[PDB]
Specification:
The structure is cut from a larger assembly and holds 9 protein chains of 9 kinds.
Chain B: H1 11-32
Chain E: H1 7-13, H2 20-25, H3 34-39, E1 46-58, E2 63-74, E3 79-87, H4 90-103, E4 105-107, E5 127-131, E6 134-140, E7 147-148, H5 151-160, E8 165-170, H6 176-188, H7 208-211, H8 213-221
Parallel strand pairs in E: 7-8
Antiparallel strand pairs in E: 1-2, 2-3, 3-4, 5-6, 6-8
Helix pairs in contact in E: 5-6
Chain H: H1 12-17, E1 32-36, E2 43-47, E3 64-65, E4 72-73, E5 79-81
Antiparallel strand pairs in H: 1-2, 1-5, 3-4
Classes of the chains: A alpha/beta (about 210), B mainly alpha (about 35), C alpha+beta (about 130), D alpha+beta (about 100), E alpha+beta (about 220), F alpha+beta (about 90), G alpha+beta (about 70), H mainly beta (about 80), I mainly alpha (about 120).
The structure holds potassium ion (K) (6 copies), magnesium ion (9 copies) and sodium ion (NA) (7 copies).
One potassium ion binds near residues 3 and 6 of chain D.
Chain C binds 2 RNA strands through helix 1.
GO molecular function (chain I): structural constituent of ribosome
Family (chain I): Belongs to the eukaryotic ribosomal protein eS17 family.
Keywords (chain I): Ribonucleoprotein, Ribosomal protein
RNA sequence: CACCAUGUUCAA
RNA sequence: AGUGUGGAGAUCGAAGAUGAUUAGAAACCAUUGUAGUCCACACUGCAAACGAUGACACCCAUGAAUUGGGGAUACUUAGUAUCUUUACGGGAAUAUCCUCAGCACGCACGCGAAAGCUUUGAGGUUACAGUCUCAGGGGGGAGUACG
């Protein structure tokens, strides 16, 4: 969603943004293609791994950021994760953006069981993988909740509305996509300026062994 | 048990019993003719 | 084999509308097919459509909006009088407020509302709503 | 009554072929179609571990360098004979669909 | 005596949502039956017990008998609600099914047969609704026709607010559990049919839980 | 201008349902899968303004798995997403 | 499934003619085997002379004797 | 976001994949070549999918071999694809 | 059969959460602590709770135990994860040179921004 | 893989 | 399977014989064994002759495969290798992509009383109409009686 009414190129991907994506291997697929995600794939490497279009990745990333930045009251944007590789990422993302999050097993009925005493009614749902976060997506389909999902090459896109084509498997790749998303949401507000680079480090978004 | 309730003997054996009945009826008409 | 070309065309358009498609390819095409499509177009039920010439029975690509619920062909043609217009809206049309019965008449292919105003009967071609 | 298997118990689709010649069951000799029968290819040792050790100890030719021969049989079973011998068991309705393409 | 457990219920109690049409417009589920109590004027909402019948589960010692109750709710002005519940007691099943009836409240579109004179009297188009094998088809009828329907569909069509209709039924209509829901499904279809009247583009609206987001945060906070 | 009207001009309709922005499908009151996504409008600088642009998607489109493709089509149509990169 | 031709009325007439005989009510009203077997001869009532009195044991699960006569 | 397919104006990639009859407009799959006699250097026009063994008019030499698909040209010959139109 | 029922296990998990500092690795001193920090009609259950609290403590000394939440341990371990390296990891990869495959460089060349400066083929 | 047949009529 | 006439007759084996089992048991089990089983010519036309699913035509979402033939190595065009190789050999098989035809598997609508079906419909049907044809009308009597 880099295109704006004035025609300005402010939200377009710069050279610094592309370098961060390439270093963390956020453009690497899973060698297993999907019909819903076929468009986002630029091509296939010699070893079979699929390559994600970086223009299409950035267009979808800004679209999700503009949707998250359009929520006047945060904490009703839920960032869910089940892989445990995005548990520190969604925790750090919620620290800066100010959203709700839930790592680990999604307790069924969290969005539908109204007497649960742990019952929440978010407006936007953000998940790290449609396959592993299928429980959260299934409940959102019963309570009118749009879904923003970090989707790989083989992701199923049922009940997900904004799919970010990304590498949601590696520790470093997940941290960057949540770092880039958090940075852009803050930039879309008045929190930080576009010219000065963000002081917060992507290393705080990486997953660490409990040992 | 592959079939449902027959409500009778086995249909194959009822068909054979009918088969033999027709044989003896056509032999009784032959001797009168 | 294929016996009715209009029946095949209207089943293809109706199927595409149920599936939410924005376009549909029709093969083959005839004068009756194009005249029928133009009647739906003049009432806003379909968008622009384009006829491709292949030196054979042509093909049509129809741009579909979401306004068409169902179109279909009535077989056989079932000749209709001016007094039978009410009986055909009662049978095949969802309401007396919307939807059209297309007939072929001596004055051309037209909907039942136009044919009734022209005071002409004809043979029932199909419907759309 | 109701169709238990889309397979119908045999490896014969509707328009694949008409007739498959039957085989004699390994155990009782019942004539069952070759695609329907429960086929197992077994490779059996001629002697068990203790018996092989005693025979290989007395064998000039057999030992660690040269292995003992095995028995290779393709066994095809009637459905009744395969269930009774427990080479195959009844399964839950959900578990009925799972197939193994290689010996495990 | 009512403590809302949902954002919609909190808005309804705070008089920020004042009509069922805001809920209907934004497709929000109703999880509390007290939302319908507030948003329907006093005396407008009527209830009626459609069907009660026992259902049995065979057990090791005899059998277990429970009761399934069908309730119809409606203001006779375009709102209908059908809810079925099972209880160990007839009275318990009856109370639970009144709650379920309010929770399943839907809007009904009423139109005209011929001239658009006065208030709408009939459904706008032919609609069918299927439950099990039972399908109920409602056909628009001229003024003064009345509800030409079986006594079970007729009661539901009276609560929905339609005056004239032609009704046909097929399947095992003596299965009144399916016949009650088939009539209800046909009335729900009235607002899903795209008529040339609704072809125009409508401007976007703000979700009630979006517009009053800052109010709803402070309710949970304090 | 939208809805069922009288001969006296009164609007007969109880309410006017939302229409899906990809299939022109009336969104029913009891589907509970239809969503409404508001995209923030961004000024000449990176900061957004108070205005937003909202899309309505019917719940059947999301169950098919085609709501992601539909939003791609709409946001490109409204000039929000760029269909391809420019010349280097 | 059935025929739908414009000039296929002869086939549709024979179809109904042949298949009406499968209706037990229709076949009974259009054949004379029911009237020839009916003692009343197609009439509502008929007079008679009593021969003897008989008691019929009612079918299960009922257990009674129904008074009857041969006429 | 990518480009949505157009039914009346298919892209090069999708039209190239299609079968010649399944194409949007029917068309041939064959062509003609200018093949020269290996021992004559005399040019004859040879059909790409020729099923009859084409001979050099002067040489009387087999210039192609029948196949289930495209014709197999003789060794030592030179060919150029003639323009279709 | 000597399984601790859920009443004993829940109560012994509550005691460890509330009096972790006072507890120990021995049954007899822990049982003394359980005696005054608990109200129960039965001495046997207090004995079974003291046995399982000691089992929890021996489990806690080896590593974290599910169902036990100690705020002092959580905050101290959280501060450890909050520490960041002197230089960012993504930077170190860029200064060391980002290597891409053949297909990735073709896409980069087609980009409007071109290939980034510190990007090379593999 | 020895042999293992049967249960009066209605109604709880 | 059965019939007729010629062969053939190893195995198996209706009928039959003998031995077991059994309360009984020319039943299951055992040993045999006639007609058959096999062939030529001529009859018969009775199958759970089944996908319990008539034929022709159109549309129809996804992933991994498989058999035969080919082609290549709302964007103006997007690679790739391996093994054998003095004569049914300018070879054979592989790999990748596409394509037509065939048998299918795990399957998005939709349908269905359900089980389930789903480009292989049982879908596109009360929003009922592409064409043709066969059959059914509660269970029996009965596919019986008569001709
Ligand atoms: K099945
Ligand atoms: K075949
Ligand atoms: K067969
Ligand atoms: K007895
Ligand atoms: K023998
Ligand atoms: K006969
Ligand atoms: Mg059984
Ligand atoms: Mg069974
Ligand atoms: Mg049966
Ligand atoms: Mg013979
Ligand atoms: Mg024997
Ligand atoms: Mg037959
Ligand atoms: Mg049949
Ligand atoms: Mg019909
Ligand atoms: Mg009958
Ligand atoms: Na089998
Ligand atoms: Na009685
Ligand atoms: Na009796
Ligand atoms: Na009795
Ligand atoms: Na016995
Ligand atoms: Na079969
Ligand atoms: Na083949």
């Amino acid at each position: 969603m880099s295109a704006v009414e004035s025609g300005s190129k402010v939200l377009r991907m710069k050279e610094s943004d592309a370098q961060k994506l390439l270093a963390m291997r956020c453009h690497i697929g899973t060698r297993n293609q999907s019909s819903a995600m076929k468009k986002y794939i630029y091509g296939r490497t010699a070893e079979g791994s699929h390559i994600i279009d970086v223009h299409m990745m950035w267009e979808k990333l800004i679209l999700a950021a503009r949707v998250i930045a359009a929520v006047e009251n945060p904490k009703d944007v839920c960032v869910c994760s089940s892989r445990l590789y995005g548990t520190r990422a969604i925790y750090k993302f919620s620290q800066h953006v100010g959203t709700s999050f839930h790592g680990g097993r999604f307790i069924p009925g969290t969005f539908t069981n109204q007497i649960q005493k742990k019952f929440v009614q978010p407006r936007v749902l953000v998940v790290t993988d449609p396959r592993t976060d299928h429980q959260a997506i299934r409940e959102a389909s019963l309570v009118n909740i749009p879904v923003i999902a970090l989707c790989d090459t083989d992701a199923p896109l049922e009940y997900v509305d904004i799919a970010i084509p990304c590498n949601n498997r590696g520790i470093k790749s997940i941290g960057m996509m949540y770092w880039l998303l958090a940075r852009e949401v803050l930039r879309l507000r008045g929190t930080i300026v576009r010219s000065v680079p963000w002081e917060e480090k992507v290393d705080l978004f990486f997953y660490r062994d409990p040992n | 048990g592959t079939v449902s309730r027959p409500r009778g003997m086995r249909p194959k054996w009822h068909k054979k019993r009918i088969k033999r009945l027709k044989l003896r009826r056509r032999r009784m008409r032959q001797r009168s003719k | 084999t294929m016996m009715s070309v209009l029946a095949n065309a209207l089943r293809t358009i109706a199927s595409a509308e149920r599936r939410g498609k924005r376009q549909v390819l029709i093969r083959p095409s005839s004068k009756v097919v194009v005249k029928f499509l133009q009647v739906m177009q003049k009432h806003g039920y379909i968008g622009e459509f384009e006829i491709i010439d292949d030196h054979r029975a042509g093909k049509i690509v129809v741009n579909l909006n979401g306004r068409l619920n169902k179109c279909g062909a009535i077989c056989p043609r079932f000749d209709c009088a001016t007094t039978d217009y009410e009986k055909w809206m009662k049978n095949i049309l969802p309401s007396r407020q919307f939807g059209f019965v297309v007939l072929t008449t001596s004055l051309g292919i037209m909907d039942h509302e136009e044919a009734r105003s022209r005071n002409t009967g004809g043979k029932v071609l199909g419907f759309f709503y | 009554m109701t169709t238990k298997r889309r397979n119908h118990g045999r490896s014969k689709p509707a328009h694949s072929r008409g007739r498959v010649k039957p085989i004699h069951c390994f155990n009782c000799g019942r004539l069952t179609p070759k695609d329907k029968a429960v086929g197992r290819f077994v490779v059996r040792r001629m002697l068990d571990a203790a018996s092989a050790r005693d025979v290989a100890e007395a064998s000039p030719v057999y030992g660690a360098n040269f292995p003992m021969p095995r028995l290779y049989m393709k066994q095809r079973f009637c459905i009744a004979c395969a269930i009774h011998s427990r080479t195959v068991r009844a399964r839950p309705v959900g578990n009925r669909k799972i197939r193994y393409t290689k010996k495990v | 005596e009512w403590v809302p457990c949902t954002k919609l219920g909190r808005l309804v109690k705070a008089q920020k949502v004042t009509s069922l049409e805001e809920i209907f417009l934004f497709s929000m589920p109703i999880k509390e039956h007290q939302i319908v109590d507030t948003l329907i004027a006093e005396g407008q909402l009527h209830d009626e017990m459609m069907k009660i019948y026992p259902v049995q589960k065979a057990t090791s010692a005899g059998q277990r008998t429970r009761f399934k109750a069908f309730n119809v709710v409606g203001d006779c002005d375009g709102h209908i609600g059908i809810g079925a519940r099972v209880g160990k007691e007839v009275s318990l099943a009856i109370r639970a099914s009144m709650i379920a009836a309010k929770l399943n409240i839907v809007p009904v579109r009423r139109g005209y047969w011929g001239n658009k004179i006065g208030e709408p009297h009939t459904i706008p188009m032919k609609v069918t609704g299927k439950c099990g094998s039972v399908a109920v088809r409602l056909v628009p009828a001229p003024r003064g026709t009345g509800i030409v329907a079986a006594p079970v569909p007729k009661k539901i069509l009276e609560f929905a607010g339609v005056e004239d209709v032609y009704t046909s039924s097929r399947g095992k209509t003596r299965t009144h559990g399916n016949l009650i829901m088939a009539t209800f499904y046909a009335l729900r279809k009235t607002y899903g049919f795209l008529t040339p009247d609704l072809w125009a583009d409508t401007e976007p609206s703000r979700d009630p839980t979006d517009e009053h987001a800052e109010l709803l945060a402070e309710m949970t906070t304090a | 201008t939208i809805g069922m009207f009288n001969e006296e001009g009164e609007n007969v309709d109880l309410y006017i349902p939302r229409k899906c922005h990809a299939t022109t499908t009336l969104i029913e009151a009891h589907d509970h899968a239809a969503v409404q996504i508001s995209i923030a409008n961004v000024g000449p600088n990176g900061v957004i303004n108070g205005t937003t642009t909202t899309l309505c998607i019917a719940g059947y489109l999301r169950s098919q798995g085609e709501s992601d493709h539909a939003i791609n089509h709409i946001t490109i149509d409204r000039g929000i997403m760029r269909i391809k990169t420019g010349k280097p | 499934t059935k025929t739908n031709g414009q000039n296929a009325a002869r086939k549709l007439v024979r179809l109904r003619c042949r298949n009406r005989w499968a209706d037990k009510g229709w076949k009974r009203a259009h054949t004379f085997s029911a009237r020839k077997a009916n003692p009343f001869g197609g009439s509502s009532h008929a007079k008679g002379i009593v021969l003897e009195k008989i008691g019929v044991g009612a079918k299960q699960p009922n257990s009674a004797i129904r008074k009857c006569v041969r006429v | 976001g990518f480009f949505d397919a157009d039914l009346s104006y298919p892209t090069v990639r999708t039209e190239r994949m299609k079968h010649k009859r399944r194409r949007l407009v029917q068309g041939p799959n064959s062509y003609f070549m200018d093949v020269s006699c290996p021992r004559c250097r005399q040019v004859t026009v040879v059909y790409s999918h020729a099923t009859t063994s084409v001979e050099c008019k002067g040489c009387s030499k087999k210039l192609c071999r029948p196949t289930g698909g495209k014709a197999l040209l003789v060794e030592g010959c030179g060919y150029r694809r003639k323009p279709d139109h | 059969g000597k399984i601790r029922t859920k009443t004993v296990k829940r109560a012994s998990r509550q005691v460890v959460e509330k009096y972790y500092s006072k507890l120990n690795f021995d049954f007899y001193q822990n049982k003394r602590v359980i005696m005054d920090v608990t109200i129960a009609e039965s001495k046997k259950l207090k004995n079974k709770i003291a046995g399982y609290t000691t089992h929890i403590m021996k489990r806690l000394a080896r590593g974290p135990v599910r169902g036990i939440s100690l705020k002092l341990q959580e905050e101290e371990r959280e501060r450890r994860m909050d520490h960041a390296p002197a230089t960012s990891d993504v930077d170190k990869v860029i200064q060391s040179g980002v290597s891409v495959d053949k297909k990735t460089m073709q896409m980069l060349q087609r980009l409007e921004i071109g290939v980034p400066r510190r990007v090379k083929r593999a």
